[model samples]
Each structure stands twice: as C-alpha cells, then as structure tokens.
Target: KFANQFIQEFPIRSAEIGQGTVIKRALPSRQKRMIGAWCFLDHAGPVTFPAGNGLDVGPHPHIGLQTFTWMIEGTMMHTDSLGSKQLIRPKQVNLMTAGHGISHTEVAPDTETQMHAAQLWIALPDHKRNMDPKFEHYPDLPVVEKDGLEFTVLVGEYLETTSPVVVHTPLVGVDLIATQDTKTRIPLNPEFEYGFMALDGVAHVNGHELTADNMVVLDTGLNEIEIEVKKGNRVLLIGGEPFETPILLWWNFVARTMDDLKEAREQWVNHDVRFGEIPDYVGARLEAPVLPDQMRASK
Candidate 1:
C-alpha cells in the first residue's frame, strides 16, 4: 500500500528535561553518521508553553560544529560562549557555531510561558574544527515570497539566494509553508543527500507523504522534488553536499583524535573553553567525569 515506506525509525536516546515534561531525541547523530559526517536532527519542543509550560535548557557545551536553533511556536533567548545575547522569536533562526568549543544557554523570556523550537547540529570539516567560536543569527525571515509561502533560510544557501550565515559545509536550509492547493518542484542537485521535513501540514515529497511532525529524508537522490499540497501544508527542506571527511563524535564533542577530546573537556570544566557558562540547565548524567572520545589533541 505504501511505496518505498522503508524508512527505519530508530528511537534514539531521550534526554530528560524539567521534571520529565520535555524529552530531547536525536536522529542522524554522530553515532549514526560518524562516517558520513553530515547532518544531525535534534527535535526539541514543538509542544506549547500553554500558560505555564516553558523551556529552560541552560548552558550546554558543543564542539566541532555550529548549532542551528529554529524557534517555532513561541520565543527563546540564546546566550553563548561568544558573549552573544539574543532573543529568538517565532520564525527566527539562531546559528551558534563553536569552532573549537563553546558553552551556551537557552530559555524562554520571563512573563512568557509557551515555547517551541528545534536545534539542529552539524559537524564541521577538518579545516573548520577549532577555528573559532562565533554566532550568526537571523532574527527574522531570511526569504519572503510574493506568494503564500514564507521561508526563513536559516543556514547555508539555496536557489539564486544565499543566507547571511557563513558555513564551511555545503548545506542549504529552508522553512516552507503552503496555505492552498499547490504543486511545484524546487530544483536541486541530485548527488546531494537531502531531507524534506514537514514542520506542519501534510504534503508529498516526490509522491512520498511528508506529514505533521514526520521527517522525510530523500534517498532517491533526485535532481528535483515535486511538492503537492492540498488544503494547506508547511515544511523544512534541508541538506547539503555531504563532505568527504571522516568525523568522530561523542556527547557534545566531535573530532578526529581521542586526545583532543580529553583536553577539550578539561578546558571546558576549567572555563578556559570559549562556550561560556550558564546559570542553570537540565542535569546531564555522564558515565565518565570527562568529555568522551574523538580526539587525541591538536599537536
């Protein structure tokens, strides 16, 4: 009944937050794609803040990549190791990149309750790793259409347009919406591995169903995607020309050597790392007191 309904949904580990009210799950992570060295999917809260519910994920550390925070429903404030402070409203995008290592904090603005957002992690290339910790965020829409669709080109580039964000990886990201019956195809290079994720509504990716809260990763490697939406639908189409470099990841760190990882953790705990510190955050249960594998130091 289903054509190529062959996607194996692996229920990745869930990190608990706020009395277990929030669960963070990662797909296509370092564990899954260490060899491929491409994209990682972190699904945070699409749940509403309601009147009291809110998100307060404070000061976490990340190495070897940039964090792309896509705020959906409500509002979130982002502060990181680069001493950058900014508020991410609905439809705004935040790109926090920790070239070496960076610490950051995130939460909802006080007096507000409902908050929803997703944070995606990307592995930096060998050259970009440990380059520098920086922040590049688009506070509002990156691309607006004369038609009904409004796309926030969060990171990388697409079509004739490019995002203000600079990334070493060849990735293009877009937040899409369709309010009426629509049929169109966005041209793309077939060799690039890509994903067509439906943030809302219901649509088809090359005749494949991309539904609410469901992500469709295109493995067909098509040169173009045909999108047909009845009634209304919205989606995020993201991917890149994956790199040829080999990446290794553990926890919040990515590297090519085991020694580099050990030093990074020590630097972070000592506050010598660039990511900074958070006032409060969800508790993380780590087996070893130190950061995990993936490096053996720089030289």
Candidate 2:
C-alpha cells in the first residue's frame, strides 16, 4: 500500500526585480517532507539577454552539498575554482560534489543569450560531507525512451536505467518527459522518498493533478507512481536519504550543530572558513542575516 501524499503546491516567489538571474526556487527548504532527500531546487534562467547583458551569479562557497546544473534551452559556460572549464549545453549535466566545501561561479555564455536551466543543491550525508570536492561533466547521459516517455536518470538507481553521475549517497535526479496522456512507473527502495517538480504542462501525479508551477511529493512505502501528462510535460524528480547530521541551517550552509553553524557564519563573514576556491568564478560568502540580530536564533 502507498501512502500517497501528492505534493502540495508551494508558493511561487518571483525573482526580485533587478535581481538579475531569474532563479526560481521550487522548494522552500531541502529538509522536511518525505520527498526523497532532495533539499534545494533552484530553476535558473531561460532568460536570454541582449549583447553584453547576461546574468552573473558570482563566486560563492557551498558546504555539505553537491551542485548539479541541468540546462533546458541554451548553454552556460562554467568555470569553478576546481579548475573546471566546461560549456554546459542542453542535455548535459554539470555536477559538483562539494564535500567538506567548494567555491564556484555561474555565468552566461553570451550576455545576450537568454539563460534557461535548473540548478539543485543536494545535502551530503555526514560520511560524504567530508569526502572531497570533485566535478563530473556528463556528456553522455543514457536516455531510455519508453512508449513516448523519456527518462534521463541523473543519479542513484532506477528501473533498467543507470546514470554515470557518481554519488556517495544513494540518490536520484531525473528528467522525465511524457507526451499526451501517458503513464510511467518508477520503482524505488522503500527507504527513499519521491519529489517531482514540473517544468511544464500538467501532471496527474500519483493520482493528483499537479500542473506547472507546482511540484509534487511521494512518501516512503509508495512502491509505484503513475504520472499522466496531457499534450506533454517536463519534470525533475529529486530526493534521497536525509542528512544524518545534527545541524542547523539558516540559508544555504549546513553544519553539525547550532554552535558549529554559528561559527560557520562568522567564518564566512570574516573569510575564515574556506572551501575549495575554483577558477573563472569568485565565491559566494554569507554575510550576516538581513533580519535583526535578535532574529538570528529565532527559527
């Protein structure tokens, strides 16, 4: 029996004007919920600009996570402190496992070309958190097309599909496409939850009507899921085992404890706690919270 908690719609937050890059975060937070352990989902771009006008999400640092970028329309030239220089186009995946820590930047290939893509941050488990920083540009992603339905397994394990995306954590990131009204079933370990973020069209996910702009969630014990799309639809499924670390997270940073998190914030402010310093991009360092000082430990 499946405990079908079809994903409820989260609010759509418009990118603040003058915010530059159009990155829409689908999930409010990566934690909570039973949807596979996929924590953070950021859909960035499809916003092409005029010549000399493009987005610059500058140098930043990430800890206890793996950064994955999957483009929808165009390409984004990537340069990270890890000495990685790769132009990621449609169907290509740029994956960076930020073990202890890592730093990098994202820039448009052409200032005029619009940017259309999805970027997600997967929290690392305690063991993988301190693993080591690395990057893998998957140019060859095995595509399994079944009955007008396509599946690109980005990570973890699923069906007859396997992905080259190395994971120290048992996780899966997939782009599922369906035309007209069709059904596709995904079998997962009872240990993993399921999450679906539709890029377009409407999905009757797990018997629930989840249209564009709203993502769905599937809890454990759900053995089979049926997705129905009229006309066509694009979707991303993210999740895995939740981090086993006892930590506190304010924004993007994750640490083992509240005190550890506080120390991380102080280091980021003072440029003390350093991750990997990549190339071509700068680094994203967190300053103090925008809210008042009293709000620091409120959440």
Candidate 3:
C-alpha cells in the first residue's frame, strides 16, 4: 500500500521585519503548531535587493529554541552574544542553540547585493531547555540523487546519507532541487509525520499538488512518498516524530509556562545577566512584546 494521506495545506502568511524585508511564515499556524521539533519556519526572498540595500536585524533574545539559518542565495553575517561570528552562505547551515537563553543579530554581509534564505526555529524539549547557549556552522553537506532530482541532506538522514549537522531530536530536513521533469520515490519512517513546502516551482507529492509558497502537511502511516516535479523546482522537506512537549511561545522565546515567559520578558527588558549582553552593534536590541492572554501551551 503506497497511498499517502494528505492532512491539510495552507498558504504562507507574509511578514515584514527589519527595514521592510518580507518573508513567508509557514509554521506555528492556527492549523498546525508543529511538525516534529520544528516550531517556526520562515522563507524570505528569492528577492534581489538594490546594490546597497539588504536586511539588517539587530540583536534579539531567545530561550528554549534553536535558530537554524539556511541560505539558498545571498549572504548574511551572524554575530551572537556567545562571541560566535560567522557568515551564512548558500547550502550552508548556521545553528544557534538558545539553551537557557541567548541574544544574537543577523545582517547583510558588507558585499551582499541580493539576499534570500530560510530561517527556522526548533523548540527545545523540557530536559534540554536550560543548557548553555552554543553555535555551530556546517559549510558542507551530503547529497542524494534520485531520478533527475537532487536532494541535499541539510540535517538528519535521507537514504543512506546522514548530514553532519547536529540535531537534538529525531527529525529530517532536506532541500530538493529538480533539474528536469522527473519522478522519484522517497522512503519514510511510518512513525514520523512529514511535510514539505515548495520553495520555488511546483511539486507533486503523492499526487497532491503543491505550488510555490504553499506547505502540505502529511499524515502518518506511510512508508514512502512519491514526488514529481518539473525542471527548476525547489522544495524543503521537514519531518519528524510529532513533538509531544507542550510549549509556550512569545516574542522569540519558547518556554514551558507563563512564569517563564514573564521572567524572560523582564530579563530582556532589564538586560539581565541570564540573557547575556551583546556588545555594541549597528542597531539597538529588539524589544520583546508583551505576552497576550491567549498565547499558551496547547499540547
């Protein structure tokens, strides 16, 4: 039985942040809280900025989440309170684990003329929430080829290849690009739920159509999925065992209770040592928004 169940699909909401740059946020939706450990997913421009214009997001704090940055185009320089500074480039992965807490910034590389990237967040589990903040960068990743499509294993494993990127949970992330009209079968773990978003062009997963800027959530119980795409299509594959941990997310912080959210807010606002201090940077640190009454753990 190769039937693949389609749960639901939704259009990505457009959001503008830092200097009017736009991004498509697909996760943490009203319809879905998460697919595995993934709690936030945002894809920004295949947009080319003017020669002198680009994105500049100032220092921001996060707790109980890891900021995962993947670039499909352009360049961004990352600087964090941990004293970690690195450049994010195409096919490269920048993982910042905001264990107990941390602050960081992202801005255009001095020479950036155009910029585009996927920025995602992974909610840390209860047991791993308070570890020390850390950062890791992977410039080379493993590749898989099927039919006329090529898949780059960004994190976790696909086929027989496992990416060297460190992960805290059981999950899979991959970038798929098709150079010609082709069809391919991908193996899956029946116990893990899966979803894929079209980054560009069109993708047919198990006969369900997914166009650019859309995400399709897949149901469990399938051992494999078939994908068909035309030339020049790109898609990001993310799947994992459903996250069972209840989490409270506010501003950029992910915590377990109202108190944690409240405390984090106070710390960031007052510049407490818990969040650590980021040295002087171009823009001022982002201010955290007050929590709404209804934002709570929905596990």
Candidate 4:
C-alpha cells in the first residue's frame, strides 16, 4: 500500500519579468533549490492584458541551460539566435537549448489579449554544457486519459506514453487536467524526486490542499500517490533523478564555477558574437545585471 509521503512545502513568490509581466515563481526557494534537473519555474499571467501590451521580453543571453516554455493560453512568438522563429500556442511547447551561448526574445502578438504560461529552466549536465545551441518547437505532444483525468506528456514518459520533445536529462513533466471532480492515483518513479503545483484551481495531495500559491515536494520512496482535483483544475507534475552536480546560477547563466559566470557576463557585456543577435526583434536587448562584490570575491 502506497501513501502520500510529504517532504516540504514552498510558497510561490511573485516577481516581475519581461516588460512588467508578473509571474509566480515556484522553484529555487530558500528551502528547496531544485527538483531533479529543473532549476527554475515561473508561472506567468492568467490575466488579460490591456490593449497594446502583453509579454514583451527582449533578447537576453543564456548558457548551460535549456529554456522550456509551456503555453496554456494565448500565443507567444519566440525568436532565438539560431534563426528560429516560432509561435507557441495552447498545448504547445518551445524548447531552446543554450548549451554554449544563445540569446532570445519572447513577445505576445499584438492581437493577443490574455496570457498564461509556464516557463522553466533545466540545468545541463557538466559534460553536455558546452554543446552547440539549438531550438525546437513541439506543436503536438502525447496525451493520456485516465479516469476523467487528461494527462499531457510534455517532456518525458508517462504511462507508456512519451513526449516527442528531447531533453538531455532523465526527467518527466506532465500537465494533469481534471474533467470532473475525482480522485486519481498516479504512479511515480521511486528513483526520482517530485514536485507538484496547481496551475489553475485548488488540488488536494495526500489530504493536503494545494493552490497556485504553493507547491509540495514529495519524497522519493513512494511508488504512487493520490490527487483529488475539481472540475477544470490543472496541475503540473515534474520529477527526475536528483541532479548530482553543484551548479552556480546567476542571471540567465547556469555554471559550475564563478569563473564561468564572469566570462559569460563579460561576453554579453562586450557584445561578443558568441550570443548572436535576434534579427528584427523590436526594442533594445536586455542588459545583464552587475555582478555583486560577494560573487566577485568568491571567484
């Protein structure tokens, strides 16, 4: 008999990113730095924007990480240094690998009004960190239905269904939607740690209530757990084998050492050709934040 094994709970904090868009950050909390290879998670607006305004993030540089965007509502246009211009819609995904270096921009079409999405960052393994940069757009993904629950496999395998999106790490991301009020048991991999967050309505995990404002981290020994969700509620389940390497994340760069961070920042500041420019992206590119003295001293 398997029961819900609770580990820790974290409160999602609010932060402003990209053209004044407010997002609820779920991962990289004080108590928990990561779950598997997932180092960052941001849930962006379920709110409608005023006319002529939406998510307008300019070109920014990144390295040693992959930016993954899952669109739930509205549309977003992604342009990267690799000359990839793609539009991500509901139930679609945009994955960009910033292995060595890359710069990209994300903006909403002028006609778009409402926006809701989840943006995540996956830290690359040390050996694969310097691979060439690439971008992929997944317009279709595998969906599994069970007991009135709709499961969209976003990254990895679930219930014998696997997503087409390729990732370097062993992990899984699933968007679980409830069509009716019910409780469902979802199997888990005992080798991987997991985190669950409610993206829409309230959900109950092992008798504990979870909202959009909070996320629950589960221990790795459990074989399965029960989740109770109401009609129209959507929740996200992400898990993976614990990341073994210690990483230093600053700004958009994920590195193993302070020297890597300093070099990347300098390259961006110097307008080096490493992070190529995005063609015809309106407005100025975002600048990197200054490195703090403590970080400089640690190098």
- What does candidate 2's lDDT look like per residue over 73-159, in tens digits? 777777666778788888888988866766666666554476667777776666777777788898877778775677788887666
**Candidate that would win on lDDT:** 4
Displacement of the residue 248 alpha carbon in candidate 4, Å: 0.5
Candidate 1 lDDT, tens digit per residue, 195-243? 6656665678767776544556654356666677664466777777756
Give lDDT tens digits, candidate 4, residues 135-221: 999999899998889999999999999999899999999999998898978899988999898989889888778898999888677
lDDT of 3 by residue, 214-262 (tens): 7888877778888898988888999888888788877898888888888
In terms of TM-score, how similar is model 4 to the real structure?
A: 0.96
Candidate 4 colliding pairs? none
The deviation in Å at residue 164 for candidate 2 is 0.8
Q: Report the backbone clash tally of model 4.
A: 0
Q: What's the residue-level lDDT of 69 in candidate 4?
A: 96
- Each prediction's TM-score versus the true structure: 0.80, 0.83, 0.96, 0.96
Off by over 4 Å in 4: 1-5, 293-299
